Structure 1
Amino acid sequence: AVPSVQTFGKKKSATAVAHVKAGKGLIKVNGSPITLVEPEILRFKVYEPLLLVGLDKFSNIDIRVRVTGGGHVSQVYAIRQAIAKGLVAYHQKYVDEQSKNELKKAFTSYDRTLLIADSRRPEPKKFGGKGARSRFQKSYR
């Protein structure tokens, strides 16, 4: 009854939680369709997990993604995480493990961090400078 898998995707502050349940195939982000994700130039980034493995895989699954935190570019990289993670976790649980496998191989061969979060984190600022490494200008005389 109502086979659903929840997942999450992270980019540098953001968290996009995606619910992948069985249905007709609507992919809505924050209540808006996937065509309405409007930084307007990263529109294919939210499309890359959709169209790397074919649109026919989404003919029966409903995906709802809600984002929080991060920025305008960081949120986009968090949705495409949760789309790929939501697709591969759904196929791990509810259909054949053979089907789960090439999805992971298709995402790995085009690894744009679809499945794995990058561990890059902001270094803390120290005193004596305006940044983590940069230092205040000295005059010597």
Structure 2
Amino acid sequence: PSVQTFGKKKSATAVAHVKAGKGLIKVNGSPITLVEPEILRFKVYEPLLLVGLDKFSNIDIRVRVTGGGHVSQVYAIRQAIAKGLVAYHQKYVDEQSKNELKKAFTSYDRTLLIA
């Protein structure tokens, strides 16, 4: 029961599969603690911490990227994980969960939803 989105920046792109599972988070076939501009790191933890890390218990996020500079990818996958997550809750859980995640993200930033 999958859904997919993609996120964009300057000259890079990222595609994110969401389907339900044991709760892991992957980038290019790697767990997310090893994404290495190393100071922008928490910048990609931001769709986890703005929501609360219980939502990521039952889902699974495969992510792979192409191109762009070494900032572009990070901005790309934070956008892509946000739109994928709100997509999943929209299609298989209640509408109001979709509302809380949407307004919850939108108050923090705007880049997460519009490229």
With normalisation by structure 1, the TM-score equals: 0.79
Q: How many residues align?
A: 114
Partner of 1:55, secondary structure, is: coil
Whether 1:84 and 2:79 are equivalent positions in the alignment is no
Question: CA shift at 1:69, angstroms?
Answer: 1.4
Query: What do you get for the CA RMSD once the two structures are aligned?
Result: 0.8
| Correspondence for 2:28 | 30
Check conservation: 1:8, 1:82, Cα contact below 8 A: yes
What are the Cα deviations for residues 58-81 of structure 1, in whole angstroms up to 9, with x where unaligned?
000000110101111011000000
CA–CA distance in 2 between the matches of 1:14 and 1:77? 10
| Correspondence for 2:14 | 16
Gaps of 5+ in 1: 117-141
With normalisation by structure 2, the TM-score equals: 0.96
CA–CA distance in 1 between the matches of 2:87 and 2:38? 28
Question: CA shift at 1:112, angstroms?
Answer: 4.8
Partner of 1:72, secondary structure, is: coil
Instruction: List, as ranges, runs of 4+ consecutive aligned residues in structure 1 with deviation greater than 4 Å.
Output: none
Do the aligned partners of residues 35 and 112 (structure 1) sit closer, same or farther apart at CA in structure 2, a change above 3 Å counting? Answer: farther
> Relative to total residues, which structure has the larger helix share, 1 or 2?
2
Question: CA shift at 1:14, angstroms?
Answer: 1.2
Bigger-Rg structure (1/2): 1
